[PDB]
A paper describes a structure:
Musashi‐2 (MSI2) belongs to Musashi family of RNA binding proteins (RBP). Like Musashi‐1 (MSI1), it is overexpressed in a variety of cancers and is a promising therapeutic target. Both MSI proteins contain two N‐terminal RNA recognition motifs and play roles in posttranscriptional regulation of target mRNAs. Human MSI2 is a 328 amino acid protein that contains two RNA recognition motifs (RRMs) spanning G21‐K111 (RRM1) and K110‐P187 (RRM2). The C‐terminal region of MSI2 has no known motifs or specific function, while the N‐terminal RRMs mediate the binding to mRNAs,25 including those involved in the proliferation of certain cancers.
The crystal structure of MSI2‐RRM1 was modeled from residues G21 to R100 and consists of an antiparallel β‐strand core that is flanked by two α‐helices. The two subunits in the asymmetric unit form a noncrystallographic dimer in which the longest β‐stands (1, 2, 3, and 6) are positioned towards the center of the dimer. The only hydrogen bond interactions between dimer subunits occurs between residues F97/R99 in the C‐terminal β7 strand of subunit A and residues V52, M53, and R54 in β2 of subunit B. The structures of subunits A and B are quite similar with a root‐mean‐square‐deviation (RMSD) of 0.81 Å (80 residues aligned) between Cα‐atoms. A small difference between the subunits was in the loop that bridges β2 and β3. It should be noted, however, that the crystals are tightly packed as indicated by the Matthew's coefficient (Vm = 1.7 Å3/Da, 25% solvent). As such, it is possible that crystal packing could affect the conformation of the β2/β3 loop in each subunit differently. Notably, R60 in subunit A forms a contact with Q81 of a symmetry‐related molecule. However, no crystal contacts are observed with residues in the β2/β3 loop of subunit B and residues T57 and T58 were disordered. A high degree of structural similarity was observed between the crystal and solution NMR structures.
Author numbering:
A (entry chain A): 19 to 100
B (entry chain B): 19 to 56, 59 to 100
The structure:
């Protein structure tokens, strides 16, 4: 549904509060989660954000660069299928 | 939480129902979900097993394949 985004490339050290704190700069956030890639303890992880205002997604995508915990992260519109 | 796994590299071919059918052979599944990237090659799948034991059966099988693609199921530790 609306307002949801899937984010790739998170540092292995990025916490959910680091993910929430960065993305709060484009709007209020309903739900936020980080999932580690366990192939290594030093592997890039994945993030999920659910914005309160679905216009927040637009604000995110209008940036050319996104950086978090010194890694370039890759926010995408989420396309879930249960 | 427990009993969760994720799979990368899913083709557009693979339906959520196909993913569920694949992993149900290792045990009953509570949740199953696919996240596509539309850009023409590989999305992500998420499965929640009823019983954590089912994760051990997936990981004790060394080679996995789904809809022509080798897949590499991994334990998922989501943290909100």
């Amino acid at each position: 549904n609306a307002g949801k985004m899937f984010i790739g490339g998170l540092s292995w050290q990025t916490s959910p509060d680091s993910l929430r704190d960065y993305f709060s700069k484009f709007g209020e956030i309903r739900e936020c989660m980080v999932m580690r890639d366990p192939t290594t303890k030093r592997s890039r992880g994945f993030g999920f954000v659910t914005f309160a205002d679905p216009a927040s997604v637009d604000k995110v995508l209008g940036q050319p660069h996104h950086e978090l915990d010194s890694k370039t992260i890759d926010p995408k519109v989420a396309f879930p299928r249960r």
